[PDB]
């Protein structure tokens, strides 16, 4: 964890961030509850309580998906606003000795491509990152639920995941 995710969360604040983590967490917990109620429904052999609980829990799933999509786009618009209007107002008060030292295309490259990355490319990647790793840890949680024998198998796959990830990341940088 670097300082840039700390400045990303400080520019996001607390108010969108609590809804950001908790709408995603209940948005995956409603889906784990939906197919856990389906796995209660498959051992039938009490009738039409299961389909009504299924209907109201997928209504809870579609409203948590709704509030998840507008909270990731609301923090995308808020950090797309507030990482401008401070960079501009802290490069507009810079001295002339700063411009005489630094190359000008570096500052214009910061104003073009990195601000383009911040408004466009970051919050869709943040949605697929949060949704992919929260589906992944809900998958690991519910595969630890159905068997205890996967919990002694989880340690070689995680140690080869950490070893192959560190051994790759020293080439990838």
């Amino acid at each position: 964890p670097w300082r840039a995710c700390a400045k990303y969360l400080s520019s996001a604040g607390i108010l969108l961030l609590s809804l950001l983590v908790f709408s995603q967490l209940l948005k995956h917990m409603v889906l784990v509850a939906i197919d856990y109620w389906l796995a209660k429904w498959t051992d039938s052999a009490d009738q039409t309580v299961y389909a009504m609980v299924f209907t109201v829990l997928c209504s809870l799933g579609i409203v948590l998906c709704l509030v998840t999509s507008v909270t990731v786009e609301w923090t995308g618009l808020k950090v797309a606003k507030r990482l401008h209007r401070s960079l501009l107002n802290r490069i507009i008060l810079a001295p002339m000795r700063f411009f005489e030292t630094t190359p000008l295309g570096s500052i214009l490259n910061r104003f073009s491509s990195d601000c383009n990355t911040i408004d466009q490319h970051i919050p869709s990647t943040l949605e697929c990152l949060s949704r992919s790793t929260l589906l992944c840890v809900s998958a690991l949680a519910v595969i630890s639920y159905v068997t205890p024998v996967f919990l002694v198998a989880l340690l070689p796959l995680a140690i080869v995941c950490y070893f192959i990830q560190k051994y790759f990341r020293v080439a990838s940088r």
Partner: protein, 346 residues
């Protein structure tokens, strides 16, 4: 480099999805072993097999979006590394109602033992200079290149830092002033032509404060009214980016016309008579010495005959004032620096 970054990014994902297919196999065989000789359910085995298929569907998106979040978080780290830069401290030490409304009523520029550097680690570019200018005086400064003559006009505006010396204008020190009040009530014109796009009426008036009468008089006194009247915008003609609709001297004359809008008592000039022709330069010298007759003008001369009609000539060499007198008093004396400047011309 993009192909090797590509083949690394497919190598990691082909190993990690091989590990994910092995996760499908080991969850499959322990769930059918625990449903073979024990009893879980039917549906719990199908749930565990389904989410074992889901973690092989989503492990590549976990590792690829973690790498993309690192690679796109580096831009946030570079924007934050730019964002921790310094400032200029635009608000001064003097109180903002200590100044009058007409602050530069006249020119009483007192140079009292001034010396500047550029940065904190290099030399004093100017040594200890001393001058005081009467408020009608159309004085000039000549000297060699690299003498600090552009740097003294930068030292009027505190662009460079004044580590010793008290430059006092009208009884008010320059270092105790707000900088927007300083650089709004004082008009430099640079040697280099800097011209934005948009149009002429944007370019002389960026903040919509002047009428067209004083703008057309500013185009008349910059020897420029005929080409703006020939070009069919009629003050709304498009100058392009960098001023490349026009010539280099036309860019210089447009920069001088943007200097002529803001009526201050001091029009400090650098060599804006550089890179124009001598006929319109001398006609422009007679125009600015009929127009700004009450105003103090201080010029840096590129040519040494437009400083010949000045009130006083301050020849600067290597940081210090060498000569400080009337131009014919510096001409009629000893074979000096100003006499060799006018001698090496003709």
């Amino acid at each position: 480099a993009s192909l090797f970054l590509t083949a690394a990014n497919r190598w990691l994902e082909v190993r990690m999805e091989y590990i994910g297919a092995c996760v499908v196999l080991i969850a499959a065989v322990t769930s059918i072993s625990n449903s073979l000789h024990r009893e879980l359910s039917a549906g719990l085995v199908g749930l565990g097999l389904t989410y074992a298929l889901m973690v092989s569907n989503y492990l590549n998106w976990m590792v690829r979006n973690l790498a993309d979040m690192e690679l796109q978080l580096g831009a946030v780290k570079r924007i934050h590394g730019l964002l921790k830069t310094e400032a200029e401290s635009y608000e001064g030490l003097l109180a903002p109602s200590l100044i009058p409304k007409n602050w530069p009523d006249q020119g009483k520029i007192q140079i009292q033992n001034l010396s500047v550097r550029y940065d904190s680690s290099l030399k004093p570019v100017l040594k200890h200079v001393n001058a005081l200018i009467a408020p009608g005086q159309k004085i000039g400064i000549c000297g060699r290149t690299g003498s600090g003559k552009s740097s003294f006009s930068l030292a009027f505006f505190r662009m460079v830092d004044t580590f010793e010396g008290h430059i006092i204008i009208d009884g008010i020190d320059i270092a105790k002033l707000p900088l927007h009040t300083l650089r709004s009530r004082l008009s430099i014109i640079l040697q280099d032509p800097v011209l934005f796009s948009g149009t002429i009426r944007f370019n002389l008036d960026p903040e919509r404060k002047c009428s067209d009468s004083t703008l057309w008089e500013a185009l008349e006194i910059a020897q420029l009214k005929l080409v703006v009247k020939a070009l069919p915008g009629g003050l709304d003609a498009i100058i392009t980016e960098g001023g490349e609709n026009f010539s280099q001297g036309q860019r210089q004359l447009f920069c001088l016309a943007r200097a002529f809008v803001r009526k201050t008592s001091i029009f400090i000039m650098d060599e804006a008579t550089a890179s124009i022709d001598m006929a319109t330069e001398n006609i422009l010298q007679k125009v600015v010495m009929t127009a700004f007759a009450d105003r103090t003008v201080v010029t840096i001369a590129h040519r040494v005959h437009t400083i010949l009609s000045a009130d006083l000539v301050i020849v600067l060499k290597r940081g210090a004032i060498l000569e400080f007198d009337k131009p014919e008093k510096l001409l009629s004396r000893k074979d000096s620096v100003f006499a060799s400047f006018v001698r090496a011309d003709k």
